[PDB]
Amino acid sequence: MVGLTTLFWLGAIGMLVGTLAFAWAGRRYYVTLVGISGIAAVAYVVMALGVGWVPVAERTVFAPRYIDWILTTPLIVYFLGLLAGLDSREFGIVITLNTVVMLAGFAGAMVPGIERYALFGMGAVAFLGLVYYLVGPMTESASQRSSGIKSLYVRLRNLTVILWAIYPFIWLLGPPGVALLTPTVDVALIVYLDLVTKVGFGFIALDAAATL
Ligand SMILES: CCCCCCCC/C=C/CCCCCCCCOC(=O)[C@H](O)CO
Ligand SMILES: CCCCCCCC/C=C\CCCCCCCCOC(=O)[C@H](O)CO
Ligand SMILES: CCCCCCCC/C=C\CCCCCCCCOC(=O)[C@H](O)CO
Ligand SMILES: CCCCCCCC/C=C\CCCCCCCCOC(=O)[C@H](O)CO
Ligand SMILES: *C/C=C(C)/C=C/C=C(C)/C=C/C1=C(C)CCCC1(C)C
Ligand SMILES: CCCCCCCCO[C@@H]1O[C@H](CO)[C@@H](O)[C@H](O)[C@H]1O
Ligand SMILES: CCCCCCCCO[C@@H]1O[C@H](CO)[C@@H](O)[C@H](O)[C@H]1O
Ligand SMILES: CCCCCCCCO[C@@H]1O[C@H](CO)[C@@H](O)[C@H](O)[C@H]1O
Ligand SMILES: CCCCCCCCO[C@@H]1O[C@H](CO)[C@@H](O)[C@H](O)[C@H]1O
Ligand SMILES: CCCCCCCCO[C@@H]1O[C@H](CO)[C@@H](O)[C@H](O)[C@H]1O
Ligand SMILES: CCCCCCCCO[C@@H]1O[C@H](CO)[C@H](O)[C@@H](O)[C@H]1O
Ligand SMILES: CCCCCCCCO[C@@H]1O[C@H](CO)[C@H](O)[C@@H](O)[C@H]1O
Ligand SMILES: [Cl-]
């Protein structure tokens, strides 16, 4: 009743609507949000059209998903870094930590043997370091800003930390890991998370930009 392609089209539409909404409201932050959801829109369309479905051993890996993540997640971290007022050196640490997470996940998905769990573990370790920087140094830094900016940062940070922490569990329980969850359920869960961590993220920012 509900196929993989239908789910991909749903993600595509959701990202498209977010993209147009952000572009209009911007008639730096607004341009970043267009990139976050705009890139994801393209990845989902490609996947909806059946492009980039790589067979690996016994499972199917969706390559556009990881290219999406590698480009859009640093933009989310960048957005949060601007809110917190990071110096260009602090940016380098967190964006480097982020890229290690994304690359490790991409590589582990593409490896058929058990070495893929070794790649997954390395992404997990780097993710814990990324969480430390969001909850600590970047929160210290955001404190120096107005009360409204600091409030916005804390809200987006909380959304980001809680939801991003769920992805490694979905990956591990799905086809890439112990292939418990079926591809359809696993995809459905990730489409939901992608939409909330990108389009939901964006709309919470828009809401605060009008409350000024
Ligand atoms: C715009 C954000 C600016 C911040 C970004 C910071 C650094 C981003 C890191 C980029 C390196 C990503 C390499 C892409 C992998 C391409 C393999 C593609 O190969 C393939 O096609 C698959 O193997 C197919 O199965
Ligand atoms: C300065 C005041 C600004 C006030 C706000 C005005 C916003 C008007 C401009 C853009 C609206 C963006 C929402 C996208 C609607 C497209 C739905 C199109 O319907 C669909 O989604 C199709 O069925 C499938 O894509
Ligand atoms: C250390 C600090 C250095 C500062 C680094 C800044 C990095 C980020 C800078 C600008 C954000 C890039 C936005 C990309 C928009 C293009 C996607 C367009 O997406 C699309 O494909 C179409 O929209 C599809 O409809
Ligand atoms: C001031 C802003 C500066 C921004 C700097 C961002 C640069 C970060 C770039 C690359 C980080 C590479 C980490 C390599 C681990 C990837 C594991 C996956 O790789 C592998 O496992 C093997 O290579 C595959 O054979
Ligand atoms: C818009 C897309 C988003 C916000 C995607 C987020 C994805 C993650 C936080 C994934 C994290 C992973 C780990 C922590 C370990 C390795 C496997 C990953 C890539 C699923
Ligand atoms: C500052 C004006 C609003 C933000 C401009 C975003 C610049 C990136 O390009 C954007 O691509 C989108 C489609 O791919 C369009 O919807 C935007 O209008 C376009 O500006
Ligand atoms: C004058 C109104 C400008 C609208 C916002 C700036 C548009 C930025 O344009 C974007 O810049 C990127 C390079 O960083 C390119 O890769 C993108 O393709 C391009 O759309
Ligand atoms: C804004 C327009 C961006 C267009 C990006 C489309 C990327 C999908 O391009 C795809 O790349 C594959 C490479 O093997 C080919 O097999 C597919 O035929 C092709 O559709
Ligand atoms: C060669 C490996 C498969 C990738 C190429 C086949 C693409 C099949 O998909 C087609 O791609 C087109 C891209 O514009 C779409 O317009 C069509 O609606 C779609 O049916
Ligand atoms: C069959 C033996 C494994 C097949 C190839 C495993 C793929 C690991 O190579 C991966 O390719 C891409 C290159 O940047 C990225 O995903 C990763 O950086 C890299 O680890
Ligand atoms: C901009 C983000 C979307 C980029 C996704 C492009 C992924 C292309 O991926 C390709 O798809 C084809 C399968 O149909 C090829 O045959 C595969 O080998 C694969 O490399
Ligand atoms: C946002 C949409 C929610 C849909 C939740 C997923 C429920 C459908 O999950 C089912 O899984 C089976 C395999 O596991 C079938 O093969 C699928 O056809 C699908 O019907
Ligand atoms: Cl996958």
Numbering used by the authors: 1 to 27, 35 to 219
Quote the study that presented this structure, word for word:
Bacteriorhodopsin (bR) from Halobacterium salinarum and sensory rhodopsin II from Natronomonas pharaonis (NpSRII) are intensively studied model systems which provide insight into how light is utilized for energy transduction or phototaxis, respectively. As with all microbial rhodopsins, both contain a buried retinal molecule that is covalently bound through a protonated Schiff base (SB) to a conserved lysine residue of helix G (Lys205 for NpSRII and Lys216 for bR).
X-ray diffraction data were then combined into sets corresponding to eight 30 ms time-windows, of which five (from 0 to 150 ms) were judged to have sufficiently high population of the photoactive state for further structural analysis. By representing difference Fourier electron density throughout a three-dimensional structure as a one-dimensional mapping onto the protein sequence, we observed that structural changes from 0 ms to 120 ms are highly-correlated and have internal Pearson correlation coefficients from 51% –71% and that this correlation drops to as low as 13% as the signal-to-noise falls on longer time-scale. By contrast, difference density features associated with helix G are weaker, yet are relatively constant until ∆t ≥ 120 ms, which is the time-scale when the photoactivated sample is swept from the X-ray beam position.
